[model samples]
Structure formats: structure tokens, C-alpha cells
Target: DCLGAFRKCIPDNDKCCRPNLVCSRLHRWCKYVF
Candidate 1:
């Protein structure tokens, strides 16, 4: 399974995240950027 939007993440999580979602302490989580 992939990390979904709004889920806790960052490359540190390094767990294959879901599509349309990105994280890196910048967003604070696997959030979707416009």
C-alpha cells in the first residue's frame, strides 16, 4: 500500500508514497500540492 494524502510522511518515511502526494518537512506531511 502507498501513503495517502495528508498521511504522515517525508522522504525519511521513504515508504513509496501515493500519487499526487509529496512530503519533505516542507509540507509537514504527504500532502497534495496544487
Candidate 2:
């Protein structure tokens, strides 16, 4: 799932109500961070 990738970016930030929105943003953040 996409949220799994999101969790990799921010482990404790997995309580998002909007999966797509949060996962999209997390993907962007992960790009920079990783």
C-alpha cells in the first residue's frame, strides 16, 4: 500500500484520514529527505 511508503517517511504520522492526500505529500517529503 502507498501508506506503507508514507510510514517509511514518517513512522508516527500514519493516522491520516485522507490516504491519497497524505501519501502524496509524504512521497514529496520522502523525495527530499531520502
Candidate 3:
């Protein structure tokens, strides 16, 4: 499914993480947008 905070994510992919989570700084990690 989706990834949560502090989880690994695909920076180039938008659906890689939760709607509220953002892939930070092209570092391929997940963080809260809010």
C-alpha cells in the first residue's frame, strides 16, 4: 500500500506515500506535509 512518516518512498512517485505524507527533499524518505 502506502508509506508512513520516516518510511522510505519513491521521490519521483506521488502515490508512494500517504496523502498527508510528502517525500522530502528528494531524499526518498517520507515526512508529514502538515
Candidate 4:
């Protein structure tokens, strides 16, 4: 699934996830990575 793709791409503990791992970051990363 696309969800797994993003997770794999960015990783849960990435610096990008700092402060929060909300939809904005996730969506942006998703579009960027996958």
C-alpha cells in the first residue's frame, strides 16, 4: 500500500518527523518519495 511506501521511504524516526508525524508532513513526503 502507499502508506507502507511512505513509511519505508522516510522512516518513522527521520528528522523530518520531528515535532510530529502528521498528515502534512506525511502527505508531502509521500508525494515526494512515492
- Between prediction 2 and prediction 4, which has the larger lDDT? 2
C-alpha RMSD of each candidate structure in angstroms: 2.7, 8.9, 2.6, 8.9
Superposed Cα deviation of residue 20, candidate 3 (Å): 0.7
lDDT of each: 0.60, 0.39, 0.68, 0.38
What tens-digit string does per-residue lDDT give for candidate 1 at 7-31? 6665766443545667746656776
Clashing residue pair totals per candidate (backbone < 3 A): 0, 0, 0, 0
Weakest 10 consecutive residues of candidate 1 by summed lDDT: 12-21
Tens-digit lDDT track of model 2 for 1-34? 2334334344456433344434335354323122
Q: Candidate 4 residues 1-34, lDDT tens each? A: 2243244334453433433432245454533321
Spell out the clash pairs found in candidate 3: none
For model 3, how does the per-residue alpha-carbon lDDT over 1-34 read when each residue is reduced to its tens digit?
5566677766677544567788775666787887
TM-score leader: 3
- lDDT value, candidate 4, whole model: 0.38
